Amino acid sequence: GLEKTVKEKLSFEGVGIHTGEYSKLIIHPEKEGTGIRFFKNGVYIPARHEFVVHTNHSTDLGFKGQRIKTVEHILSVLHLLEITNVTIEVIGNEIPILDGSGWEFYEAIRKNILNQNREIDYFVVEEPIIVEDEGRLIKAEPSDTLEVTYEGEFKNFLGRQKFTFVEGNEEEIVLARTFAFDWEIEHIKKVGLGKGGSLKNTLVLGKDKVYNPEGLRYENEPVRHKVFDLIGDLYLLGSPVKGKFYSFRGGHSLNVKLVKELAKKQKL
Ligand SMILES: C[C@@H](O)[C@H](NC(=O)c1ccc(C#Cc2ccc(CN3CCOCC3)cc2)cc1)C(=O)NO
Ligand SMILES: [Zn+2]
- The structure was resolved experimentally with NMR
Confirm or reject: Cβ of 201 under 6 Å from ligand 1.
no
Coil, strand, or helix at residue 111? coil
Active site residue 187: no
Q: How many CB atoms lie within 10 A of CB 230?
A: 27
Closest ligand to C-alpha of residue 105 is 2
- Tell me the best of 74, 161, 188 to mutate to test the pocket of ligand 1, counting ligand atoms within 8 Å of each CB and taking the most: 188
Closest to 83 in 3D by CA, of 124, 122, 113: 113
On whether the CB atoms of residues 34 and 143 are closer than 8 A, the answer is no
Say how far apart CA 50 and CA 44 lie, in whole Å. 14
Residue 231 Cα to ligand 2 middle (Å):
10
Number of Cβ within 10 Å of residue 239's Cβ equals: 17
Instruction: Report helix, strand or coil for 207.
Output: coil
State the pairing for strand pair 86-91/36-40: parallel
Strands 241-248 and 146-153, by their bridges, are: parallel
The three-state secondary structure class of 62 is strand
Contact in structure between 72 and 98 (CB atoms under 8 Å)? no
Q: How far apart are the first and last CA of the chain?
A: 19
d(CA 185, CA 195): 10
Q: Could you tell me the residue ranges of all domains in the chain? A: 1-121, 122-268
> Distance from the CA of 196 to the center of ligand 1, in angstroms?
8
CATH superfamily to which 1-121 belongs: lpxc deacetylase, domain 1 (3.30.230.20)
CA dist., res. 121 & res. 185, Å (int): 40
Contact 151, 227 (CB under 8 A): no
User: Which distant-in-sequence residues (6+ apart) come within 8 Å of 100 by Cβ?
Assistant: 17, 177, 178, 200, 201, 202, 203
The CATH T-level fold of domain 122-268 is: lpxc deacetylase, domain 1 (3.30.1700)
Q: Which residues line ion ligand 2, judged by CB < 5 Å?
A: 178, 229
